[PDB]
Structures are given as structure tokens and as C-alpha cells.
Amino acid sequence: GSHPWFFGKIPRAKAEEMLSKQRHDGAFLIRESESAPGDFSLSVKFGNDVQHFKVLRDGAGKYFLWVVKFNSLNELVDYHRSTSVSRNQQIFLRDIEQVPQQPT
Amino acid sequence: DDPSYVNVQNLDK
Numbered sequence: 001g002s003h004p005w006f007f008g009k010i011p012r013a014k015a016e017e018m019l020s021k022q023r024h025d026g027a028f029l030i031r032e033s034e035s036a037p038g039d040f041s042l043s044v045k046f047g048n049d050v051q052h053f054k055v056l057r058d059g060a061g062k063y064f065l066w067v068v069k070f071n072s073l074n075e076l077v078d079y080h081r082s083t084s085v086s087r088n089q090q091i092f093l094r095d096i097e098q099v100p101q102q103p104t
Numbered sequence: 105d106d107p108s109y110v111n112v113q114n115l116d117k
Contacts, residue, residue, distance in 0.1 A: 012106075012107060012109070016107070035106070041109055042109070051109070051110045052107070052109040052110065053109050053110050053111045053112075054108075054109040054111050054112040054113075065109070065111055066110070066111040067111075085110075086110070
């Protein structure tokens with residue numbers, strides 16, 4: 001239990017910063033709308049820029065942010081981790097910042 | 105000054 005991609009209450013820009021030093025175009029993190037009282041969202045590096053998806057709720061507890069929805073945040077990650085995200089290339093959610101635990 | 109989020113509904117608001 002933890003969050004290898006979720007953040008909590010940060011600014012999309014902060015997620016646009018940790019995603020800018022990333023290396024795999026797919027790196028992602030989820031943000032709880034720092035401007036809202038609690039609006040889920042997610043930043044991800046596609047090519048080098050940081051585009052984010054708005055996260056919504058089905059009103060029952062589901063979470064979505066693009067096309068298909070799910071029943072868990074990390075669930076939407078793994079899904080988009082094997083499924084592309086944009087119709088322009090094949091990008092997927094990946095791990096951002098934190099480096100590969102133990103990287104010098 | 106918000107960048108929005110790719111899926112984010114259009115700015116129609």
C-alpha cells in the first residue's frame with residue numbers, strides 16, 4: 001500500500017514538472033485538483049510535454065478520465081498502462097519521479 | 105490560466 005504515481009493535493013504544473021524530467025513518454029501521476037476542493041486528475045508525459053486527464057466519478061465510486069472508467073484510481077492506471085491514451089501515438093501511464101528505488 | 109486536461113470537457117463550460 002502506497003502511491004507510486006498518485007500525489008494528493010498538488011498543482012497540475014507540479015505534475016507537469018516532475019513529468020518534464022521523466023524519461024519514458026507515459027510517466028504519470030494523479031492530482032486531486034489543487035484548485036478544487038478535491039477534483040481528481042492526472043498528468044502524464046506524452047512525447048515530452050505534460051498533458052493531464054480530468055478524473056470524474058460515476059456517482060457510485062467509479063473513476064474515469066478519457067474513455068473507459070474503472071472502480072479504482074490505480075486501476076485506471078494499469079488499464080491505460082497497457083492501453084494507449086492518445087489517438088496520435090501509443091502512450092501509456094508510467095511511473096514518475098522517485099527513480100527506480102535504489103538508483104544510487 | 106488553466107491548461108485543462110486532454111479529456112477535460114471542451115472549454116464550453
